[PDB]
Write a sequence for this structure.
């Protein structure tokens, strides 16, 4: 009934009671993607959600359990998009999640500018300005862009966001342990929003033992 | 031999084995002060430290136990400076800590520009730009400025630091509990420093029950 290919396995999205096709060589979802999904505030009802760098469709799958909103997941690489399309179909989420194999820099070819509620991006340079530019252009006034990035880039990024009319409103730092510095930061920008950031409680990934933190355990297992 | 006056009371700085004159009515030091002190990296030997809004001398007293460096505490409010001066004398630190009563906007009337190693400020509008400009103007190349402020101001603060050639390099967030947003941020700027921020492990103040975290207990109790 399901057709797995070569290296592939059917994993579990445990909190969400879903399954995802995954490959140890080609693609595996990271903690970052789960954290970004959780960080994202969805519309109260309905809405349009675009995942810009979809990969094997981890984020659309995660967000789908939370909203009735329509979701587009954009992924340029055929192999990754085909995994996503198959995972969506296995889960019977075809009528809610639409995976498009297309270059994000060109997605304006298919999707109108400035009509989206939420744009999401978990990048796997100057290419980073493009994804911010494109995210911004997809959003209507009041729309959110949610990114994961490396903290060392955060200020250079805020400058880029504003260049395109996104104002940072929520920032969340991720710290491997309670005594290490941040390696991941989450950012929400409102399209044409008023200034003001709230620094959300940080995520601490592991305790000293190196086992997942309770906050993490609830996120991965429900 | 020492004369307290009025409401005043003589408090313990437990980690530092010192005493500090204080008034519930007029001035008591906050956790912000203690955290700013702890936050601040001090020169390997010697050096010149300026505490810009000194109050009752809390930071200078705290920094003194850690370095052999000379410390100038600036406080224009007559009553607070007096408490500091008397606290410095009680602790027998007059040869290391100088309390000075002058407008900080005009402090270069008394202290030469660009000769200090470390500037410290924990404020009690435009007045913020004032203090950041002044702090910058007192530091030599590679000198550090340490500020405590509200997170909502952070991004605007950075614009300011840079306007006066202070590059941010270390940022620490303070969260009351682990499930609450940040209410305080500590920032370090190197004068003419090279870009690049490290987001230092955040501080969580109180636990789920209501009392101080272990991290905070050590800062307060040694």
């Amino acid at each position: 009934k399901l057709k797995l290919i070569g290296d592939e396995r059917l994993d579990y999205l445990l909190a969400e009671n879903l399954r995802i096709i995954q490959s140890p060589s080609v693609f595996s979802f990271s903690i970052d993607a789960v954290l970004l999904a959780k960080f994202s505030y969805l519309p109260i009802r309905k809405g349009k959600i675009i995942d810009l760098c979809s990969g094997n469709g981890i984020i659309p799958l995660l967000l789908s359990t939370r909203t009735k909103a329509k979701i587009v997941g954009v992924e340029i690489q055929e192999r990754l998009a085909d995994m996503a399309k198959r995972s969506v179909a296995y889960n019977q989420l075809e009528d809610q999640i639409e995976i498009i194999e297309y270059d994000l820099k060109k997605i304006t070819d298919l999707i109108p500018k400035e009509r989206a509620d939420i744009v999401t991006c978990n990048p796997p340079m100057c290419t980073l300005e493009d994804t911010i530019r494109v995210a911004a252009s997809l959003l209507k006034q009041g729309g959110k862009a949610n990114f994961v990035h490396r903290p060392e880039r955060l200020l250079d990024i805020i400058d880029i966001m504003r260049k395109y009319r996104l104002e940072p409103k929520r920032i969340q730092f991720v710290h491997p342990r309670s005594d290490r510095e941040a390696n991941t930061v989450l950012v929400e920008g409102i399209k044409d929003g008023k200034p003001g950031v709230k620094y959300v409680p940080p995520v601490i990934v592991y305790d000293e033992l190196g086992e997942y933190t309770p906050v993490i355990k609830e996120i991965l297992y429900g």
User: Anything to note?
Assistant: Residues 8-222 of chain A form a domain with the Rossmann fold fold (CATH 3.40.50.150). Chain A has six helices and ten strands. Strands of chain A lie at 9-13, 18-22, 48-51, 70-74, 97-100, 116-121, 139-149, 166-175, 184-191, 198-204.
